[PDB]
């Protein structure tokens, strides 16, 4: 009936006993465990957002889709990052089927789970990503911005740092043919330009007005860093 959820409401109320019981009677009688509420979400989008490992291991390993979207294209694994939750994250990693689950999926804003994970800053869920295969140069079509540029946007050494630690393409370009670099040197943002730098930065990247970082420094400190 119509506004008769329980499956969902065994999840928000923490009850795994009844998620059990409730999974149990659904597969004797052919139904689908990923069946939406008014808001498009799952139950096992519901384990994610209400941080409930143990119950995202049950659903999952009972056949509850990690692909299912909710609202806004988000799969579970793109709801574990934008809830900094390693915890499901991993219990969903850990749980679905070879060749069910897919890193690279785009929500309807166009961004991956890494993307998410980035933005949050969360490093825990970022490693996560990347050691299960995520595509660390993976670009949303919106702005055509990997990861590690949407990283100095954001003005974060931290997840600068993680993300060429773990072979990120320093020398990405976005449309218009900027680098992470002519951002940082742009901003002045010291820091970030030597990380940049002294990873391999290009600074003779010609972007579509024709300018390289070093054209764009915004002062004489990151011009001499980008000089040596």
Known sequence: EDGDTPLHIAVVQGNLPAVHRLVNLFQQGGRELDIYNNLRQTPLHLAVITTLP???????????????????????AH????????????????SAAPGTLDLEARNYDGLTA????????????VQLLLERGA???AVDI???????IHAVENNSLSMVQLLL????????????????????????????????VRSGADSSLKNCHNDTPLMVARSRRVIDILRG
């Open 135 to 137: 595509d660390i140069d």
């Open 54 to 76: 143990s119950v995202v291991r049950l659903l999952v390993t009972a056949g509850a889709s990690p692909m299912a979207l909710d609202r806004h294209g988000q799969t579970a």
């Open 142 to 148: 919106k702005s055509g911005r990997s990861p590690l």
């Open 79 to 94: 709801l574990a990052c934008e809830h900094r939750s390693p915890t499901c994250l991993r219990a969903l990693l850990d």
């Open 165 to 196: 630690q773990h072979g990120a393409n320093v020398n990405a370009q976005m449309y218009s043919g900027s680098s992470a670099l002519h951002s940082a040197s742009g901003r002045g943002l010291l820091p970030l330009v030597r990380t940049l």
């Open 114 to 125: 890494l993307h998410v994970a980035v933005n949050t800053e969360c490093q825990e869920t």
